């Protein structure tokens, strides 16, 4: 019988060439991808499926790419297993995700979505173009000094000759795991320095800037805009925001968190603990990654290994 689902829409990171080619033969997919070619101006389906890979890897491109595959990922998920979506409690998307979960949840129509992720994706990659900023990926544990860890990066930094250099938080992902972001310089000091503040392991992330953090503020006011031509309605499912890791409530609010979402750090971990807190007596939802790659199922386990036995892909590939 019925068990509640929890949908989780993919971010940047995601995208893979290719990607789209499992979701082409299901109704109304390549409806979806047409209409994105209208909002977007080039043929997104296309270099989806072939690339080039750097190209599609490219914040503008990569962003738009992902929302239309998730919600394609949708439609594959509720022609397969209707009751899933009929049985939705919760939705979450990691960053460019929240606008496919919002768009998934009755928020904004899918038109308007494409349009805000475009403009969102276009000025990131301008805002990333002002000074050179990257994004690392941290695991630490119980003992990490993450905090001191930063300032001394930034101070650093100082001593470079970087002014109001940025180095902080930008994701959380899951217990003891972070990714900083912010000018190079620190990151690099960060890399070099990691035991000292007894991380365990680091990673840069290959993407063109330092998002979540005050270095993504030029993208703010145009984001703003675009949203200000959205019509945002009330979330028909619980939709659960990256700025607190709380399920959006008034929708005259919605538009102000997803500008503030840009320059704020993911709480994705906080989130994760959010959803998967059950009421007594009451079931594990199934989890559903409705999306390319399965990187957030990969998160989920070490977020919370027993709500991991439920969870499922959608193959976009």
């Not at 929890?6 to 990171?13: D, E, M, S």
């Not at 000094?145 to 180095?167: D, M, T, Y």
């Not at 840069?204 to 703010?220: C, D, I, K, N, Y």
Request: aromatic content about 8%; some cysteine; proline content about 5%.
């Amino acid at each position: 019988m019925g068990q509640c689902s929890v949908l989780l829409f993919p971010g940047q990171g995601s995208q893979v060439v290719g990607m789209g080619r499992g979701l082409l033969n299901y109704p109304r997919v390549r409806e979806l991808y047409a209409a994105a070619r209208r909002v977007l101006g080039y043929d997104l389906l296309e270099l989806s499926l072939h690339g080039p890979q750097e190209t599609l890897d490219r914040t503008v491109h990569c962003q738009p790419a992902i929302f239309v595959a998730s919600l394609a990922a949708v439609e594959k998920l509720h022609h397969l297993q209707p009751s899933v979506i009929e049985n939705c409690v919760a939705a979450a998307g990691f960053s460019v995700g929240e606008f496919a979960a919002l768009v998934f949840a009755g928020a904004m129509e899918f038109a308007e979505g494409l349009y805000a992720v475009k403009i969102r994706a276009e000025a990131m990659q301008e805002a990333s173009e002002a000074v050179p900023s990257g994004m690392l990926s941290v695991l630490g544990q119980p003992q990490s000094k993450f905090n001191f860890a930063c300032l001394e990066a930034r101070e650093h930094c100082k001593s470079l000759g970087i002014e109001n250099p940025v180095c902080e938080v930008s994701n959380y992902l899951f217990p003891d795991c972070r990714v900083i972001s912010g000018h190079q310089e620190a990151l690099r000091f960060l890399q070099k320095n990691s035991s000292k503040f007894h991380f365990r392991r680091t990673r840069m992330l290959p993407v063109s800037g330092a998002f979540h953090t005050r270095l993504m503020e030029p993208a703010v006011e145009p984001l703003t805009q675009a949203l200000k031509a959205v019509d945002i309605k009330k979330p028909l499912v619980s939709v659960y925001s990256n700025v607190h890791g709380h399920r959006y409530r008034h929708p005259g609010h919605i538009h102000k968190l997803l500008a503030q979402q840009l320059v704020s750090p993911v709480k994705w971990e906080q989130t994760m603990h959010a959803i998967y807190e059950r009421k007594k007596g009451r079931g594990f939802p199934q989890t559903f990654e409705v999306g390319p790659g399965r990187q957030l199922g990969a998160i989920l386990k070490s977020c919370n290994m027993q709500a991991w036995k439920s969870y499922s892909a959608v193959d976009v590939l």
